[PDB]
Design a protein around this nucleic acid. Structure first.
Lengths: 260, 134, 218
RNA sequence: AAUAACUUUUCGAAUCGCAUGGCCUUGUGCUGGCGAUGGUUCAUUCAAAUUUCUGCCCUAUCAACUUUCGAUGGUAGGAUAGUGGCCUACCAUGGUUUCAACGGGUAACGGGGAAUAAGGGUUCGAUUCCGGAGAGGGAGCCUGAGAAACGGCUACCACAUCCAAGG
RNA sequence: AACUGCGAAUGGCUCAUUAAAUCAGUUAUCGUUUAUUUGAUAGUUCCUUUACUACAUGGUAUAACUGUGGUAAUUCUAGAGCUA
């Protein structure tokens, strides 16, 4: 209708934000940015609903206008900024650094990291073009453009990028035997190995993923994010290491650890 | 009225808002209710916050009586308890003054009236007064 | 009708009321912008030439230049056109407007004095109304005093005195387009940022050519 | 990316705030920080417009519809942000249909869903979410990135207000 | 106050039209536009290249305001001065 929309309603927000049904008619409506709004996290959701550092939306802005929150090494001041996958939100007042990375239930995890590993991130390359004046570039999964990459970088590789400079450090190719991170679908937040990749000319190549517990599942190619070699990731990992216990074990782990 | 016990649960320090925030759990086994003002007195003693760096707002007496639970804030350096508190919660404690203004009906009716003129308005008042005078 | 005679050289304004049909009839069949000699208007008006500038009819509708056939006509009026102020941008409106030729239906009419004759009018010629503001932009103050390109116009600004009841304080415009060391720092920094950026891309391109030359060893 | 050119010659910072620092050849000298606004192209995001496949209730008391004032296709053009009979010129005679076209009706917005609950089904869904349409009816447009916008503009009709009767 | 910039195309209401239409799931854009957000991105601007043209920085033209008015009437406005 006549132009882009500015509102977003509760019961239309992404379910991995875990906003409650009642107590509000609307939802934060992420701004335009590096990450698609279905798979991003607004800063208000991360500092009020996850960290509980705020009780209202009014004092999220009170926090943000003091230039406390840095996303990817730069101070960001809008309330509904689209933070997403491997974003490196750091609160210097608390000296807490975070990396946004997925739960095994598909949610975003409160994953706290150190001062080192808060100075880089990984971005899956979307396309490798040759821009004008003959200068090649890559773009990453968060819309970052890096000029003059290494000529052995092709699509679906991951790339380790510095946050102070924006340059490209060493990278990881895409072949069998590499650790992955699944970023969309039924198996969101699961960690495994490339072992078989099915080419399909005409659309949607599929990858067979094998985790450490000898299970196997299949996702599309565009839900797969390589994060290093087997047993040697390039980032820290959340609780559980993306393992997808069935509901029988999760009943067992809960009741055993409830007490002792 | 034998005793009241202040139990502060779920204490989270908030450096980037310059405050400490927690769940107040008061156990008043014979009192009727516990009346937030002397909670602000008693919470000041256990945190050294001179009754102006503290705020309690959300209390609910449990069914059957004898227990009430609410939220509580304790600030650093009272000058920062006016920087970050909402104005409505300062005027409960007397730190801020209740600002006086007309109702929304008059505040909107005035804007629509003032939207009709263009400019200062005192160029037209000069030329309409002389027609009213003569 | 009624007259609004303005004398622009002195900047004075005064309204006259004439009821004589024979003096009014000279104004008839005349378009706006046509000069009218005033010797037929009055004994005091010898030597004067008046240029018709505008006015309103008996219902308040103003005349408009170029709108010949002097009867009320509705036009679609746009921005940068008189008798209309657009309420929102892009809006244009159809409004009534009155023709340029003077007729007997005008409630008022506005005139300017082009050339002064021999005679004197007490309400319009002797009294002076001064210019409201002085120049604010730097060259507008330079050529107002006939200053050269080096005369440091900062101290030649028109400066009005204001007293509350007992304290004469003076206020002046902030001179725009004024050459300041801050403006010279800004020009230097943007100019330097262009050279420094250009050298860094020439270094990154040269380094990349070294990498490709290394890969041609295989 | 390269060559030869072309252009009512697009862009290539005459903008703003806090700071005020370093060098000697002592000049309002030469340099110099943080960040606001802008700007060409590319990418990204928020979109939008088209678009493929399959799927809709009652009716034969509707069996033949569509071409000539575009219906189906071809070539070229115009126009559009762009594809395309979208429009035009020329040319061909196509296209749909008893596996129900075309016409008619609907007290028909579509869907997620609701009611009833052996299974299978029957009935409902204006209406808390998604998509569409509309702002008394129908056209036409300005501005803009985005509207055929109506708490924008250009005249009507179920209309209808004000008066000094001129608007 | 007013000029400039942005927004007013979101929201909210309703279900009249609409029966391969809308819509649902599923595709394509190697068939396009895209303010804003985010990341990149601009040593070439001049004249057959010596008497050259401001770059320590070019020009008017208006609002607001002053002043004189019209109309029974409205977010009606005219003429004259000034200045970003």
């Amino acid at each position: 209708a006549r132009g882009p929309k500015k509102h977003l309603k509760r019961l239309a927000a992404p379910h991995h934000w875990l906003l409650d049904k009642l107590s509000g008619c609307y939802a934060p409506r992420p701004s335009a940015g590096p990450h698609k709004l279905r798979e991003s996290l607004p800063l208000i959701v991360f500092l009020r609903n996850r960290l509980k550092y705020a009780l209202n939306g009014r004092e999220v802005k009170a926090i943000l206008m003091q230039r406390h929150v840095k996303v990817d090494g730069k101070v960001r001041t809008d309330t509904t900024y689209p933070a997403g996958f491997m974003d490196v939100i750091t609160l210097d007042a608390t000296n807490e650094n975070f990396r946004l990375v997925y739960d095994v239930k598909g949610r975003f995890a409160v994953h706290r990291i150190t001062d080192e590993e808060a100075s880089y991130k990984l971005g899956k390359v979307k396309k490798v073009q040759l821009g004008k004046k003959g200068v090649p570039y890559v773009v990453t999964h968060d819309g970052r453009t890096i000029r003059y990459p290494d000529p052995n970088i092709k699509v679906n590789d991951t790339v380790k990028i510095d946050l102070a400079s924006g340059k490209i450090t060493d990278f990881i190719k895409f072949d069998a035997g590499k650790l992955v991170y699944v970023t969309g679908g039924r198996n969101l937040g699961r960690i495994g190995t490339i072992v078989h990749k099915e080419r399909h000319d005409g659309g949607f190549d599929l990858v067979h993923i094998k985790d450490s517990l000898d299970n196997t599942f299949v996702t599309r190619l565009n839900n797969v994010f390589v994060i290093g070699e087997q047993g040697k990731p390039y980032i820290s990992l959340p609780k559980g290491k993306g393992i997808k216990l069935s509901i029988a074990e999760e009943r067992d782990r809960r009741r055993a650890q409830q007490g002792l | 009225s034998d005793a009241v016990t202040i139990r502060t649960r779920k204490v989270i320090s908030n450096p980037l808002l310059a405050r400490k925030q927690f769940v107040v759990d008061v156990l008043h086994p014979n009192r009727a209710n516990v009346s937030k003002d002397e909670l602000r007195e008693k919470l000041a003693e256990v945190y050294k916050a001179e009754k102006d760096a503290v705020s309690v707002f959300g209390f609910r007496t449990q069914f059957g009586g004898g227990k009430s639970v609410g939220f509580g804030l304790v600030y650093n350096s009272v000058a920062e308890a006016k920087k970050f508190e909402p104005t409505y919660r300062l005027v409960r404690y007397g730190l801020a003054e209740k600002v006086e203004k007309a109702s929304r009906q008059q505040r909107k009716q005035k804007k629509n009236r003032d939207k009709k003129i263009f400019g200062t308005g005192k160029r037209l008042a000069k030329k309409v007064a002389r027609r009213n005078a003569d | 009708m009624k007259l609004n005679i303005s004398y622009p050289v002195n900047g004075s304004q005064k309204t006259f009321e004439i009821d004589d049909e024979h003096r009014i009839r000279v104004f008839f069949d005349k378009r706006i912008g046509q000069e009218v000699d005033g010797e037929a208007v009055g004994d005091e008006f010898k030597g004067y030439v008046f240029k018709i500038s505008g006015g309103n009819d008996k219902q308040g509708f103003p005349m408009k230049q170029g709108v010949l056939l002097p009867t009320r006509i509705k036009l679609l009026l746009t921005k940068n056109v008189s008798c209309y102020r657009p309420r929102r941008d892009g809006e244009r409106k159809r409004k009534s407007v009155r023709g340029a030729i003077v007729g007997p239906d005008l409630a008022v009419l506005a005139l300017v004095i082009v050339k002064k004759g021999e005679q004197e009018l007490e309400g319009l010629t002797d009294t002076t109304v001064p210019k409201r503001l002085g120049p604010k932009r730097a060259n507008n103050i330079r050529k107002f005093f006939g200053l050269s390109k080096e005369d440091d116009v900062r101290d030649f600004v028109i400066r009005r005195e204001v007293t509350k009841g007992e304290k004469t304080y003076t206020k002046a415009p902030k001179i725009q387009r004024l050459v300041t060391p801050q403006r010279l720092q800004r020009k230097r920094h943007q100019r330097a940022l262009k050279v420094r950026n250009a050298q860094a891309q020439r270094e990154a391109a040269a380094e990349y050519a070294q990498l490709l030359a290394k890969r041609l060893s295989e």
